[PDB]
Scaffold this active site. Structure first.
Site, PDB file in Angstrom:
ATOM      1  CG  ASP A 193      45.503 -72.695  46.662  1.00  0.00           C
ATOM      2  OD1 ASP A 193      44.288 -72.913  46.861  1.00  0.00           O
ATOM      3  OD2 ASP A 193      46.065 -71.633  46.999  1.00  0.00           O
TER       4      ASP A 193
HETATM    5  C1  LIG Z   1      45.925 -57.836  32.504  1.00  0.00           C
HETATM    6  C2  LIG Z   1      44.756 -57.718  33.488  1.00  0.00           C
HETATM    7  C3  LIG Z   1      44.979 -56.725  34.650  1.00  0.00           C
HETATM    8  C4  LIG Z   1      45.233 -57.373  36.042  1.00  0.00           C
HETATM    9  C5  LIG Z   1      44.447 -56.741  37.236  1.00  0.00           C
HETATM   10  C6  LIG Z   1      43.734 -57.740  38.200  1.00  0.00           C
HETATM   11  C7  LIG Z   1      43.914 -57.460  39.731  1.00  0.00           C
HETATM   12  C8  LIG Z   1      43.849 -58.698  40.684  1.00  0.00           C
HETATM   13  C9  LIG Z   1      44.524 -58.551  42.088  1.00  0.00           C
HETATM   14  C10 LIG Z   1      43.599 -58.875  43.303  1.00  0.00           C
HETATM   15  C11 LIG Z   1      44.143 -59.901  44.335  1.00  0.00           C
HETATM   16  C12 LIG Z   1      43.072 -60.707  45.089  1.00  0.00           C
HETATM   17  O1  LIG Z   1      43.061 -61.912  45.073  1.00  0.00           O
HETATM   18  S1  LIG Z   1      41.776 -59.791  46.044  1.00  0.00           S
HETATM   19  C13 LIG Z   1      41.526 -60.483  47.777  1.00  0.00           C
HETATM   20  C14 LIG Z   1      40.059 -60.900  48.064  1.00  0.00           C
HETATM   21  N1  LIG Z   1      39.857 -61.737  49.264  1.00  0.00           N
HETATM   22  C15 LIG Z   1      40.374 -63.027  49.457  1.00  0.00           C
HETATM   23  O2  LIG Z   1      41.060 -63.531  48.567  1.00  0.00           O
HETATM   24  C16 LIG Z   1      40.074 -63.768  50.760  1.00  0.00           C
HETATM   25  C17 LIG Z   1      40.160 -65.317  50.699  1.00  0.00           C
HETATM   26  N2  LIG Z   1      40.677 -65.802  49.411  1.00  0.00           N
HETATM   27  C18 LIG Z   1      40.112 -66.897  48.725  1.00  0.00           C
HETATM   28  O3  LIG Z   1      39.151 -67.437  49.265  1.00  0.00           O
HETATM   29  C19 LIG Z   1      40.686 -67.382  47.358  1.00  0.00           C
HETATM   30  O4  LIG Z   1      39.645 -68.131  46.826  1.00  0.00           O
HETATM   31  C20 LIG Z   1      41.950 -68.293  47.465  1.00  0.00           C
HETATM   32  C21 LIG Z   1      42.233 -68.670  48.915  1.00  0.00           C
HETATM   33  C22 LIG Z   1      43.112 -67.507  46.884  1.00  0.00           C
HETATM   34  C23 LIG Z   1      41.775 -69.666  46.631  1.00  0.00           C
HETATM   35  O5  LIG Z   1      41.078 -70.547  47.338  1.00  0.00           O
HETATM   36  P1  LIG Z   1      40.892 -72.312  46.820  1.00  0.00           P
HETATM   37  O6  LIG Z   1      41.623 -72.985  47.953  1.00  0.00           O
HETATM   38  O7  LIG Z   1      39.387 -72.457  46.803  1.00  0.00           O
HETATM   39  O8  LIG Z   1      41.575 -72.327  45.470  1.00  0.00           O
END
Ligand SMILES: CCCCCCCCCCCC(=O)SCCNC(=O)CCNC(=O)[C@H](O)C(C)(C)COP(=O)(O)O
Ligand SMILES: CCCCCCCCCCCCCCCCCC(=O)OC[C@H](COP(=O)([O-])OCC(O)COP(=O)([O-])OC[C@@H](COC(=O)CCCCCCCCCCCCCCCCC)OC(=O)CCCCCCCCCCCCCCCCC)OC(=O)CCCCCCCCCCCCCCCCC
Ligand SMILES: CCCCCCCCCCCCCCCCCC(=O)OC[C@H](COP(=O)([O-])OCC(O)COP(=O)([O-])OC[C@@H](COC(=O)CCCCCCCCCCCCCCCCC)OC(=O)CCCCCCCCCCCCCCCCC)OC(=O)CCCCCCCCCCCCCCCCC
Ligand SMILES: CCCCCCCCCCCCCCCCC[C@@H](O)O[C@H](CO[C@H](O)CCCCCCCCCCCCCCC)COP(=O)(O)OCC[N+](C)(C)C
Ligand SMILES: CCCCCCCC/C=C\CCCCCCCC(=O)OC[C@H](COP(=O)(O)OCCN)OC(=O)CCCCCCC/C=C\CCCCCCCC
Ligand SMILES: CCCCCCCC/C=C\CCCCCCCC(=O)O[C@H](COC(=O)CCCCCCC/C=C/CCCCCCCC)COP(=O)(O)OCCN
Lengths: 104, 165, 88, 70, 128, 459, 175, 178, 124, 63, 84
Positions: free
Chosen positions: C43
């Protein structure tokens, strides 16, 4: 200028400026050697309140300590020769009122 | 005079640690150095003990008298309380330094370049080590008296520095 | 300093070492030129963790814009050599 | 002006016996000094002069009359 | 939910907390594209004049010239006497002078009165 | 006194009869020789003066100024040798003639037993400087700068002539000795108030006093390097010397008359020091620093105490030397970059280390680092002002802090950081420039060994 | 040393204790000062004697300049410039001499404070009181003259001081 | 740094950037390696739950509360590599970087030392002199009309050609010249 | 501490103010009132030039300690007995000061008891 | 050998110039070098005068 | 004279999570259905001379044994010399 991107390939890496770009009227105010506006983890107002509150509290506590001192259960220190009259200032031609110390 | 010795040696130990770890200063990226580099470890331990006014150590003959004189003088109560809390916090960050720099598992990058075997560093550190061990006794016993001593004291007030430390 | 002058062979060996310590990717399958998404089925999050592992291994950190287009161990080694000015 | 020590790459670094013996000797010297000073000069910590109790003093030496003379 | 961050003049808003970046429209994308287009044109011109082996001088920067000219020489021709300018100029140029004059005059009158009354104790005051 | 004046006059035929390629060498050698002759004047007495004749006298207030004036000409020639390379021989000879005439006028001005002669020469110095500024100037604003410089001075000094002729009609003499010995108090009258103003404003405008300092940045920025050197080093001290000479007849009127000017100078040093913090031009920054220093000298002269006078003399000499060195350094940078902007050429310590050392020493001397004579004058004036009023210490400390701030700002902006990439015409510093800086800086550190030579007649 | 007068710069007899060693341990101070003597004081003394004999080979003298007394400002006419010049020069010389007298007294006070050690507050009352008198006199004579001081202004100040004293004495006697 | 920037960042790049920042700050909070491994795996598990979400609106609503949560708990003193823009040795060696054109002003007595180096430098100068004249025309013919749309440069396409605008990228002083 | 709490939380008039102590005549308790003694004279004590704050009733032992410290110099621990004597004499001075404080406190106690007894008698 | 020449050109020569400068020029003027008076204890004797300070008042010694 | 000795890396098969707190981390992770993909990368920090740790009190008491023995010997010598 401190909060500009440090990874862009600026023509002037130290000042973080690009040739031909418009220059802010107060550029010499923000040159990474002077006042900066980078966001802080804590808000400005909360920081001000915390800093001011601590200082005000320290001052008021110091004043209270002045009002309420600390000492030991003892009397004043005693000095033999008329409270050391001759060796403190002198004036040997006045014959001061003698002070004599109480032995217990 | 006492702080000169032990604080200069503390900076020497810190600089040796920084150089041995490829100019890395953060303590989150230094782990087990008690065995990996022992001369710096023992010098820093002795300096920390001296800094905290350990009995019969360079820091004792000054800091203990400071605490005793502040405790039996017509001064502010707030200032005395702040001084005691400052002594406690001094012991506390000395403990922080030792714990986060020498005790845990290593946290530095895998390529180990740790080395102390240089005569200049060893001699320079050990001279100030001997100083921070014996200079307090020597100077205190060689200078003439210049103030009235605090001969008699309450037992709990005599131990207050050690208790808070 | 007393830092040995690391070479291209050392950089490649260290990169492959850290990659073989990554349980997600089989040691036999990977090759200097082995791609990440297609040849090994990883990934993008796996790619960013690989970049972070490289960063922790070599003690320097790669900008995100450059890191997001580092897709093979060979070009990772090339990037590191270009950054640290490695001769051979 | 030191000796040659190579890196180790994830193994415990090489140690010279001289640095180990020097560190152990200096730590032992420091602890021996503390013990020697505590033995010879114990009053520097616990004190040598007892602290009197003021409530234990009799009214005779304190110049107190039984609340009637003055 | 977490406590909100309130920006100020000297602590600006983080880029990742801007609601503007989340409101994406084709006009916004076109604006960003043309911004990077003009930036790339400027960078191309600078690098073309920079990598030239023939050039052995300073690359003149019209932006720097405009900055210095606006800071120094373009002020007065654009000046217009307004209530704001008049009041600020009067305050910032007259108030401090009279304030300091009052302070020093009061201090010196007090000192002269004490000297005339003779109660100042100027013993050992030889050099002035 | 003629043993100095006559060789300076003979400098002109020597220059005009020199070979086309030997003007600079001969002028420099003979100017240095003239300076050596001037050194004899420093020996001074604790008594009245060195009264050579009815026309000229020397004093321990005039002697350091004369020595500095004679010493400045070889440095100005060295600085001007560079940018006048492509000039015809006749015009170079005319430039040298202007410099020689200015030196002669200054030399005769500083001796000047009689006040109208002082006024005549004090005004004669105005013409060669104007010609130098408006003829050999690079920019197009040199004409406006020369107009400002001429008209401010003339508007200030025209009432002084009327005041002087009135004073001679009433008293009967303008010889400084008779004026000093026959001095009489000034009654608090409107006519006396206006006479005081007419006597004071001419020297105030050339200090420059805050609010009347507008001409100085224009004239200093638009002048060639030699003109900037002379304006910053000697021409500013004419007002201070005139005030020191003329405040003998203004008593006891000066006690309350001085307040408007004292307040203006005390606030204007802060104002100009703060202005120096936000400046994009080296020359403008140096000019405003000069304004601050001269405002503090004005405060010293207005306080009118022995420590004030000693500090004012020392600060005048030290400021002249330091400002000349700073202007020379700025000109060395400008002749390489042709921009005169602080932010363009950066990190020059990497490319020019010895010139960076010169920059550091000049900035430290401007910062008034002890035991330099700059701090000697600064501290004497501060102590005198504190005795005048204990509240002045706040303004003096603010001025000191801001002065250190902008001095180190100017040093760091130009010498430290990363070099500008596209600037590749920064050649190694020539021996001429290094010798110029050395001859600027060594006299300061030699004079700090004998401070009594520059402490004036009240030492 | 005969190079200065002992009466102008008085010093106590400088009584010093005698060495009374209580133990058999040889102190290092005596050995160090003996080796210092041998390695420093002897070559220096030899060089000084050589230079002194070379100076004695060529001896010549210089003299203190004596100045006659001239009429002061109080007996000069209103516009007589020559006597005013002479009186001004004499007054300036007297001012310098007064300054140097104050310098001598200040040097005495400083030397007393350093010499008396911890008991300076009691053992230097004499120098402090002399300095009090000298400072009071000097202050009366020259304070507030200004940068442009002269004998005429000092005379005017003295005149107003004597007028004030006479008025106060008359008011006190006639009280 | 080396790569040319784009006109904007897509959602996927922003999500990756937040993931990297959160992991770095979690490592800064969790000093020990085993604790960091545990909490980083938990972070990845919490992070990839919404991987398969499809519509744009809810995806944009996410990552935003995530950025706010990150800012609330962002460890105001994170770990920084020494050479990073915030590290303790970010620009330590920038005072030792001297440009290459400074060698053109060396005295002939100085250039007498190192003759082979200066011969090689002259060869490089000749190569640059020819390559620049080729590169000007190559870039003129390759650039789109109306000016470039991005600050990305094309490689060399002929045999003897060199990449356009190469002199000041190849001749960097060094990372640690001294 | 306990006196601090007793004064600042209890009755202020119940206990003395250390600035103004003592508040009663020395002879109020008993008429004997033997005087304190000095061994060191003025001249020798000035010559030893100890310090003004060291010029107390304990000066003789301090002079003897300095006599040792000057005499047995290389053996910087030869006279430990004189240090002991000086410390003991300062301890005696301190315990005398504590006795003064305690005496004044109980005199104030009995005084206040006296006027409250008179108040009760007058109200009766 | 390096230490011997160093101990002459860097220690012995400077101390020779300073001792000559102090012993013959600085002390030529009064009050230039002022020394703290030596402490006098009871029982001491003086080289210059020879008199002996009388002992103290035989304080009652116990513990 | 620099360190050009051709240092060779150990074998990657040497590092095992077993016997380290990383095993406990994996045990906790499996209770939630998770696994650490970088667990073997950090196993070298608990393997060699880094496997044994020292406590704070033990760190402070670095040379207490030899110092105590020397103190006992010295006090015995002092007692045997003074009692003469
Ligand atoms: C210590 C600090 C504090 C912590 C707080 C931080 C909070 C973070 C939590 C939020 C979770 C989320 O991801 S928020 C959700 C937002 N929406 C999406 O993720 C839709 C599609 N996802 C993608 O496209 C990504 O890139 C992916 C497929 C994963 C990679 O793709 P690759 O195939 O290109 O690697
Ligand atoms: C030397 C060392 C340092 C020194 C520092 C240097 C500082 C010295 C310079 C100081 C300069 C300040 C004063 C400038 C003059 C003001 C007038 C002007 O400039 O004309 C332009 C301008 C004329 O232009 P206009 O076409 O008629 O109208 C344009 C306005 O936009 C239209 O405005 P409006 O129509 O809204 O105006 C209505 C109203 C303005 O209403 C207000 O809100 C302001 C009232 C308060 O005006 C009034 O009621 C007048 C009162 O005048 C103004 O607009 C503003 C006038 C009101 C300003 C008040 C003056 C400030 C007070 C200063 C006096 C203190 C000392 C004075 C000494 C006098 C004795 C010696
Ligand atoms: C402290 C006593 C010293 C005794 C030794 C005698 C030293 C003679 C120096 C004569 C005056 C210096 C001339 C200025 C230009 C320097 C020429 C040059 O380019 O050097 C190239 C030369 C060759 O090096 P390079 O590798 O070819 O050039 C590469 C770059 O240039 C890179 O070169 P760099 O990185 O090495 O930097 C150049 C260097 C040199 O540049 C400078 O900045 C030196 C000038 C500093 C003064 C700045 C003005 C502040 C007011 C001071 C006025 C007092 C002057 C006293 C009379 C002076 C007589 C002329 O700058 C510094 O090192 C930093 C200076 C900051 C020092 C701050 C302390 C000043 C106040 C201390 C109190 C002084 C009196 C003590 C009173 C109480 C005790 C009795 O290097 C040197 O020889 C350095 C000069 C020696 C350092 C002088 C530091 C203190 C001396 C101040 C004056 C003498 C005091 C008399 C008391 C004696 C007891
Ligand atoms: C612009 C940048 C700076 C330039 C330089 C500025 C410095 C010039 C300022 C001049 C100094 C003050 C001038 C006169 C001072 C005398 C004191 C007087 O003004 O105060 C009161 C005077 O009262 C009133 O002020 C009367 C004068 C009122 C008219 C003056 C105009 C006020 C403002 C003008 C300022 C303009 C300056 C710029 C001109 C272009 C005292 O009351 P009184 O006891 O009765 O008079 C005493 C004098 N006697 C004994 C001779 C009679
Ligand atoms: C009185 C002081 C008045 C204030 C002077 C203002 C000067 C402004 C010009 C300075 C130039 C700009 C500048 O220096 O930049 C700010 C510069 C850079 O910021 P860094 O924190 O270092 O961050 C770098 C890493 N990114 O920081 C500074 O140095 C600014 C320092 C200003 C200090 C002002 C506060 C002083 C207040 C003192 C109050 C206490 C009084 C003393 C008590 C004594 C009791 C006996
Ligand atoms: C940078 C520009 C500054 C320009 C100078 C500003 C101040 C100018 C000084 C005032 C001008 C006149 C000077 C007076 C000449 C001296 C003569 C004198 O003092 O005698 C007075 C003469 O006094 C006057 O006549 C003064 C009249 C003033 C008329 C001219 C006004 C010019 C402007 C005045 C206001 C501005 C002054 C200060 C300006 C501040 C700075 C801008 C007494 O005359 P008598 O009649 O003989 O004796 C009286 C007994 N019977």
């Amino acid at each position: 200028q401190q909060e500009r991107d440090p990874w862009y390939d600026w023509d002037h890496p130290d000042l973080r400026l690009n040739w031909g770009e418009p220059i802010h009227w107060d550029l010499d105010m923000y040159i990474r050697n002077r006042v900066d506006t980078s966001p802080t983890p804590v808000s400005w107002n909360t920081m001000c309140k915390h800093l001011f509150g601590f200082v005000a509290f320290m001052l008021f506590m110091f004043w209270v300590g002045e009002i309420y001192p600390s000492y030991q259960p003892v009397g004043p220190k005693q000095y033999p020769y008329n409270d050391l009259y001759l060796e403190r200032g002198g004036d040997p031609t006045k014959e001061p009122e003698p002070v004599v110390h109480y032995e217990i | 005079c006492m702080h000169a010795f032990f604080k200069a040696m503390l900076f020497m130990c810190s600089g040796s640690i920084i150089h041995s770890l490829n100019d890395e200063q953060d303590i989150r990226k230094m782990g087990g150095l008690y065995k990996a580099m022992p001369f710096t470890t023992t010098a820093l331990i002795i300096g920390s003990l001296a800094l905290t006014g350990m009995p019969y150590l360079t820091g004792f003959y000054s800091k203990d008298l400071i605490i005793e004189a502040v405790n039996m003088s017509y001064t502010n109560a707030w200032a005395l309380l702040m001084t005691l809390i400052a002594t406690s916090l001094t012991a506390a960050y000395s403990t922080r330094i030792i714990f986060f720099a020498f005790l845990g598992k290593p946290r530095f990058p895998p390529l180990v370049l740790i080395n102390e075997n240089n005569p200049l560093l060893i001699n320079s550190i050990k001279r100030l080590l001997i100083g921070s061990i014996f200079a307090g006794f020597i100077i205190s016993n060689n200078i003439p008296p210049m103030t009235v001593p605090n001969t008699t004291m309450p037992l709990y007030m005599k131990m207050t520095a050690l208790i808070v430390t | 300093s007393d830092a040995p002058p690391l070479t291209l062979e050392a950089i490649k060996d260290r990169v492959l070492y850290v990659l073989k310590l990554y349980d997600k990717i089989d040691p036999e399958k990977l090759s200097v030129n082995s791609h990440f998404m297609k040849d090994l089925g990883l990934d993008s999050l796996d790619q960013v963790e690989i970049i972070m592992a490289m960063e922790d291994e070599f003690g320097f950190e790669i900008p995100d814009i450059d890191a997001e287009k580092l897709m093979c161990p060979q070009e990772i080694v090339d990037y590191i050599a270009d950054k640290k000015d490695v001769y051979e | 002006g030191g000796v040659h020590i190579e890196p180790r790459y994830r193994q415990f670094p090489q140690l010279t016996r001289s640095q180990l013996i020097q560190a152990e000797f200096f730590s032992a010297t420091m602890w021996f000094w503390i013990l020697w000073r505590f033995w010879h000069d114990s009053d520097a910590v616990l004190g040598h002069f007892p602290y009197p109790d003021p409530s234990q003093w009799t009214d005779e030496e304190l110049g107190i009359l039984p609340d009637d003379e003055d | 939910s977490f406590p909100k961050y309130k920006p100020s003049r000297l602590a600006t808003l983080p880029a990742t907390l801007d609601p503007a970046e989340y409101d994406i429209s084709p006009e916004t994308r076109k604006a960003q594209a043309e911004r990077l287009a003009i930036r790339s044109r400027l960078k191309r011109e600078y690098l073309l004049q920079y990598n030239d082996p023939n050039r052995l001088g300073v690359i003149e920067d019209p932006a720097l010239i405009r900055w210095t000219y606006a800071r120094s020489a373009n002020i007065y021709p654009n000046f217009r006497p307004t209530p704001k300018t008049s009041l600020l100029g009067a305050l910032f140029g007259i108030g401090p002078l009279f304030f300091w004059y009052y302070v020093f005059k009061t201090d010196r009158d007090k000192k002269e009165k004490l000297i005339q009354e003779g109660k100042l104790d100027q013993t050992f005051n030889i050099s002035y | 006194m003629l043993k100095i004046i006559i060789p300076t006059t003979m400098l002109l035929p020597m220059t005009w009869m020199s070979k086309h390629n030997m003007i600079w060498i001969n002028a420099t050698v003979h100017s240095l020789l003239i300076s050596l002759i001037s050194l004899s004047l420093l020996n001074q007495l604790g008594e009245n003066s060195l009264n050579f004749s009815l026309t000229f006298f020397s004093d321990s207030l005039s002697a350091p100024l004369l020595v500095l004036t004679t010493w400045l000409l070889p440095l100005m020639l060295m600085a001007s040798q560079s940018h006048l390379s492509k000039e015809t021989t006749t015009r170079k000879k005319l430039y040298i003639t202007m410099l020689i005439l200015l030196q002669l006028f200054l030399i005769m001005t500083f001796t000047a037993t009689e006040l109208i002669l002082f006024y005549i020469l004090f005004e004669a110095t105005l013409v060669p400087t104007l010609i130098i500024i408006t003829r050999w100037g690079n920019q197009t604003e040199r004409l406006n700068a020369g107009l400002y410089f001429l008209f401010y001075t003339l508007a200030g000094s025209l009432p002084l002539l009327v005041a002087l002729v009135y004073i001679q009609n009433t008293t009967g003499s303008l010889n400084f000795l008779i004026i000093h010995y026959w001095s009489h108090p000034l009654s608090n009258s409107w006519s006396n108030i206006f006479m005081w103003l007419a006597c004071i404003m001419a020297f105030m405008v050339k200090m420059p006093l805050y609010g009347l300092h507008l001409w100085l940045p224009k004239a200093h920025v638009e002048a060639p390097i030699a003109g900037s050197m002379v304006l910053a080093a000697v021409l500013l001290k004419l007002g201070g010397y005139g005030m020191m000479r003329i405040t003998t007849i203004l008593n006891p009127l000066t006690n309350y008359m001085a307040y408007p000017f004292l307040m203006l100078s005390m606030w204007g040093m802060i104002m100009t020091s703060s202005i120096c913090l936000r400046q994009t031009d080296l020359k403008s920054l140096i000019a405003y620093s000069s304004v601050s220093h001269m405002a503090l000298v004005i405060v010293a002269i207005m306080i009118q105490t022995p420590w004030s006078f000693m500090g004012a003399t020392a600060l005048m000499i030290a400021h002249g030397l330091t400002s000349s060195m700073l202007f020379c350094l700025a000109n060395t940078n400008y002749e390489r970059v042709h921009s005169r902007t602080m932010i363009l050429a950066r990190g020059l310590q990497t490319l020019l280390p010895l010139m960076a050392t010169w920059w550091l020493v000049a900035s430290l001397t401007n910062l008034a680092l002890p035991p330099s004579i700059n701090l000697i004058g600064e501290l004497f004036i501060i102590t005198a002002s504190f005795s005048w009023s204990n509240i002045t210490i706040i303004l003096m400390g603010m001025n000191m802090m801001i002065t250190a701030l902008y001095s180190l700002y100017m040093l760091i902006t130009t010498q430290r950081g990363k070099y500008t990439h596209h600037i590749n015409n920064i050649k190694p510093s020539f021996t001429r420039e290094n010798a110029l800086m050395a001859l600027h800086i060594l006299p300061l550190l030699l004079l700090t060994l004998n401070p009594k030579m520059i402490l004036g007649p009240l030492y | 040393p005969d190079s200065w007068d002992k009466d102008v710069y008085p010093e106590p007899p400088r009584r010093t204790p005698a060495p009374a060693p209580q133990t058999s341990l040889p102190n290092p101070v005596t050995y160090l000062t003996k080796i210092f003597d041998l390695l420093v004081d002897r070559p220096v003394t030899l060089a000084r004697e050589f230079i002194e004999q070379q100076h004695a080979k060529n001896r010549y003298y210089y003299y203190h300049r004596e100045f006659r007394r001239v009429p002061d400002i109080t007996e000069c006419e209103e516009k007589d410039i020559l006597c005013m010049f002479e009186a001004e020069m004499q007054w300036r010389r007297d001012y310098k001499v007064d300054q140097e007298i104050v310098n001598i007294i200040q040097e005495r006070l400083k030397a007393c404070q350093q010499r008396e050690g911890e008991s300076y507050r009691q053992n230097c009352a004499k120098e402090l009181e002399q300095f009090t008198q000298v400072s009071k006199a000097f202050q009366d004579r020259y304070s507030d003259l200004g940068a442009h001081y002269s004998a005429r202004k000092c005379l005017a100040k003295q005149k107003q001081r004597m007028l004030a004293e006479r008025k106060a004495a008359k008011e006190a006697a006639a009280a | 740094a080396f790569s040319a920037p784009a006109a904007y960042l897509t959602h996927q790049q922003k999500v990756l950037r937040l993931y990297k920042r959160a992991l770095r700050h979690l490592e800064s909070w969790c000093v020990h390696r085993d604790k960091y491994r545990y909490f980083a795996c938990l972070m990845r598990a919490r992070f990839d739950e919404h991987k398969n979400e499809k519509d744009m609106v809810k995806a944009t609503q996410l990552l935003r509360q995530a950025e706010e949560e990150f800012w609330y708990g962002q460890h105001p003193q994170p770990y920084i590599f020494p050479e990073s823009p915030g590290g303790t040795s970010y620009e330590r060696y920038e005072c030792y970087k001297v440009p290459e054109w400074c060698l053109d002003d060396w005295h002939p007595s100085e250039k007498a030392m190192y003759p082979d180096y200066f011969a090689k430098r002259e060869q490089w100068k000749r190569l640059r002199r020819e390559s620049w004249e080729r590169e000007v025309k190559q870039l003129q013919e390759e650039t789109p009309p109306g000016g470039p749309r991005t600050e990305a440069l094309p490689p060399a396409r002929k045999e003897g050609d060199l990449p356009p605008l190469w002199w000041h990228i190849v001749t960097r002083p060094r990372e640690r010249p001294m | 501490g306990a006196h601090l709490a007793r004064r600042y939380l209890g009755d202020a008039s119940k206990e003395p103010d250390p600035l103004r102590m003592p508040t009663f005549p020395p002879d109020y308790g008993f008429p004997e009132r033997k005087e304190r003694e000095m061994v060191a004279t003025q001249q020798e004590m000035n010559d030893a030039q100890l310090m003004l704050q060291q010029r107390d009733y304990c000066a003789h032992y301090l002079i003897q300690l300095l006599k040792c410290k000057r005499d047995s110099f290389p053996n910087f621990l030869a006279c430990k007995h004189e240090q002991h004597d000086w410390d003991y004499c300062e301890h005696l001075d301190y315990v005398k000061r504590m006795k003064e404080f305690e005496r004044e406190r109980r005199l104030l106690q009995r005084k206040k008891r006296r006027e409250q007894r008179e108040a009760e008698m007058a109200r009766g | 050998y390096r230490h011997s020449i160093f101990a002459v050109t860097h220690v012995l020569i400077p101390v020779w110039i300073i001792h000559y400068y102090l012993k013959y020029h600085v002390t030529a003027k009064p009050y230039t070098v002022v020394e703290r008076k030596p402490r006098i204890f009871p029982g001491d004797t003086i080289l210059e005068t020879g008199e002996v300070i009388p002992l103290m008042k035989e304080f009652p010694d116990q513990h | 004279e620099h360190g050009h000795s051709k240092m060779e890396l150990p074998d990657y098969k040497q590092w095992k999570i077993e016997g380290t707190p990383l095993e406990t981390v994996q045990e906790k992770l499996a209770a939630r259905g998770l696994r650490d993909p970088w667990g073997r990368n950090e196993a070298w920090r608990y393997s060699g001379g880094f496997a044994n740790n020292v406590s704070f009190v033990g760190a402070l008491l670095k040379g207490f044994k030899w110092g105590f023995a020397a103190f006992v010997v010295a006090v015995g010598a002092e007692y045997y010399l003074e009692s003469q």
